[PDB]
Design a protein around this nucleic acid. Structure first.
Ligand SMILES: Nc1ncnc2c1ncn2[C@@H]1O[C@H](COP(=O)(O)OP(=O)(O)O)[C@@H](O)[C@H]1O
Ligand code: ALF
Ligand SMILES: [Mg+2]
Ligand SMILES: [Zn+2]
Length: 661
RNA sequence: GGAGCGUGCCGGGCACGCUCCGG
């Protein structure tokens, strides 16, 4: 299959060496077009080196095996893999290759590197191909790489690589006016240093349907959770507490209350707020999947549990546990979201032939939908072979899927060994399954880019796209708005394409200049906030029992990421709990040791890091209240702390530790 | 499981997600 006319046309500017964005519909074959650009680019001058940037782990392998491998007749093409069992540094890999395919953060790491073997410059490439280039916005890695490109361009750096952006959907960036949308397109062009947006000016699409579901007539499971939540809030004895149970707003307010209580050391308020968040999580789960999924959320929280507040809460759950379980087994109170999804799958998987992705928000939700499908008698004998697909995201609630684990599911899905995926947003862009003919979006609240992309996974002739949402909801509204935003985005792109060259050029220079200036201001602002306090005047307190445990001056950063306490006497404040934590990925310089906890109350603090031949405690900031002479604050991220932290030195630490004994 | 980022949401937060951690 040689290139279609539209492909050749879309890459004509790139073939003349112009920076461009190729804007072609989902599944139009932007990738093969880009490969052709790389072939002629590399042919047209020796010494050329191409970087192909992607934004999902599995796209590295997909792009190699289905497209970029054809360049191996004449050129060396390397796909970066986190699973290589002969690992070297990026610079070595890239400098010894004609084409390097990697996730963008791999390149950004190399572009910022200290060590000489790993270091790379933008000038070491003659072409950057940026897949799904609509992510080249704000502080995403695509935009960090390109902001550096702009800085260099504006200072008169020469032989910067050519830029080839690929996307189906620049988006409108929240803008709902023509003027706004046009400005957003220009901002994307500015970010990517685009000379021309090239399209097919001179690919089937699915029939779309709204599968609306009504609120549950009777929800005694949810009602009972709400009654319990009211009881806990009465026990807290506080006026003006929120009543809007089962909402993300209540979730926010109750965690904010939890944080204020942590900051003032209000133990009873904080612990009750903690548990209330869990009950609220259960309501959200109840509204999204099965009652029993919501029950298991609460049950696992209380199974792993003295203090009279915490025993009041244990007692309160125990008093309702059996009733909650029995209600959860009752077919009468089934989730209409799930009934609707059953109808859809019953209709489209009769007779095997259908090849579907059901998109859901959370990793947990994907797993719960699979279990639901496997427990649903109405869907048996339909030859539905389903699996979960998630990305590499990870949390206590739900672990991720590694590169290989993702690839295993995708490869079986490709020819129908599996015929249905329950997927997170990991598979909304880029994934190419020619036989996929059904996409269902299950109660999602996304922008128009995610809508267009997810729809686009249905590659087949006569594909179907279903919006499964609650009737009269914000989800339905946002889907309808998003549809109009696609049309508006298209209008905006056409206006930028027809813009007088001189007016376009002046506008790009202006946006680029403002971008590089705004970055400098943001950087200076971040530095000032970081220098507000002497580290010696910052104390860390255990969030549970409020005991003082270390100071800011005890903290160092290992590998510009991991915040460790280097004080030899800090070991008297934490206790190591048995059980080595195991990650799937093994690192070069370290592995995780055991979890650490507060030695005076057993509150979780973080974990051991076995860094070369020493063991260092990593402190997770969320388990502490940070106290300065001005305020007490609960932090989510280390990056918002207002004292400076020095980089860890291994040599200096080893030297100082071998003094006492 | 630490970090980076994004999306949704609320008047700087909340939630979720993806990515990085020798490729
Ligand atoms: N000229 C062509 N002839 C036949 N098939 C093609 C051609 N160009 C691309 N394809 C195929 O079309 C499918 C979609 O291409 P892909 O690059 O994933 O689309 P996107 O533009 O969304 O990245 C792939 O299976 C690809 O191999
Ligand atoms: F790049 Al696409 F669907 F637009 F994989
Ligand atoms: Mg693609
Ligand atoms: Zn403690």
């Amino acid at each position: 299959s040689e290139l279609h006319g539209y492909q050749l046309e879309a890459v004509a500017p790139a073939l003349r060496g112009r920076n461009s964005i190729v804007w072609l519909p989902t599944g139009a074959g932007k990738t093969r077009a880009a490969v052709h650009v790389c072939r002629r680019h590399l042919e047209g001058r020796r010494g050329g080196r191409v970087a192909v940037l992607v934004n999902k782990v599995h796209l590295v392998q997909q792009h190699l095996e289905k497209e970029f491998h054809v360049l191996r007749d004449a050129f060396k093409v390397t796909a970066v893999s986190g699973d290589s069992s002969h690992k070297c540094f990026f610079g070595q890999l890239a400098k010894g290759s004609d084409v390097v395919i990697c996730t963008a953060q791999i390149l950004q790491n190399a572009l910022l590197s200290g060590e000489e073997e790993a270091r790379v410059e933008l000038t070491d490439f003659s072409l950057l191909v940026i897949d799904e280039c609509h992510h080249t916005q704000k502080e995403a890695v695509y935009n960090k790489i390109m902001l550096s490109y702009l800085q260099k361009k504006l200072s008169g750096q020469r032989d910067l690589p050519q830029i080839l952006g690929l996307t189906a959907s620049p988006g409108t960036g929240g803008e709902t006016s023509f003027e706004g949308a046009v400005e957003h397109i220009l901002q994307i062009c500015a970010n990517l240093d685009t000379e021309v947006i090239a399209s097919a000016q001179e690919v089937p699409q699915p029939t779309k349907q709204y599968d609306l579901c009504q609120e549950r007539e009777q929800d005694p499971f949810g009602q009972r959770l709400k009654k319990i939540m009211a009881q806990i809030q009465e026990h807290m004895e506080m006026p003006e507490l929120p009543q809007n149970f089962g909402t993300q707003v209540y979730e926010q307010r109750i965690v904010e209350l939890e944080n204020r209580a942590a900051e003032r050391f209000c133990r009873k308020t904080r612990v009750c707020a903690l548990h209330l968040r869990r009950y609220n999580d259960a309501l959200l789960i109840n509204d999204t999947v099965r009652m029993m999924d919501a029950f298991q959320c609460l049950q696992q929280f209380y199974a792993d549990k003295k203090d009279p507040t915490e025993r009041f809460l244990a007692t309160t759950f125990e008093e309702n546990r059996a009733t909650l379980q029995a209600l959860a087994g009752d077919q009468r109170y089934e989730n209409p979201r799930l009934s609707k999804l059953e109808e859809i799958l019953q209709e489209h998987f009769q007779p095997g032939s259908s090849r579907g992705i059901v998109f859901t928000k959370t990793r947990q939700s994907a797993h719960s939908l699979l279990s639901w499908l496997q427990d649903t008698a109405g869907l048996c004998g339909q030859h539905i072979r389903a699996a979960v697909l998630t990305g590499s995201g990870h949390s206590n609630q739900a672990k991720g899927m590694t590169q290989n684990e993702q690839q295993d599911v995708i490869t079986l899905f490709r020819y129908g060994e599996l015929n249905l995926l329950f997927s997170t947003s990991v598979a909304e862009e880029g994934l190419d399954i020619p036989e996929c003919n059904i996409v269902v979006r299950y109660g999602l609240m996304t922008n128009e880019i995610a809508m267009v992309q997810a729809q686009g996974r249905a590659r087949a002739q006569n594909s179907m796209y279903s919006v499964l949402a609650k009737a009269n909801s914000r989800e339905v509204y946002r889907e309808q708005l998003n549809e109009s935003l696609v049309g508006l985005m298209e209008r905006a792109i056409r206006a930028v394409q027809a813009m007088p060259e001189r007016k376009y050029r002046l506008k790009i220079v202006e946006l680029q200049r403002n971008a590089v200036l705004s970055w400098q201001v943001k950087e200076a602002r971040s530095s000032e906030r970081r220098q507000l306090h002497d580290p010696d005047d910052v104390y860390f307190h255990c969030v549970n029992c409020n005991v003082a445990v270390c100071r800011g001056s005890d903290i160092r950063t290992v590998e510009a990421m991991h915040h460790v306490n280097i004080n030899p006497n800090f070991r008297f404040y934490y206790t190591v709990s048995s059980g080595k934590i195991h990650f799937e990925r093994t690192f070069r310089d370290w592995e995780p040791g055991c979890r650490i906890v507060c030695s005076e109350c057993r509150q979780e603090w973080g974990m051991e890091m076995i860094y070369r031949n020493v063991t260092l405690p990593i402190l997770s900031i969320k388990n502490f209240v940070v106290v300065t002479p001005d305020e007490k604050k609960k932090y989510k991220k280390w990056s918002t702390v207002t004292f400076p932290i020095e980089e860890f030195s291994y040599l200096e630490y080893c030297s100082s530790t071998q003094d006492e004994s």
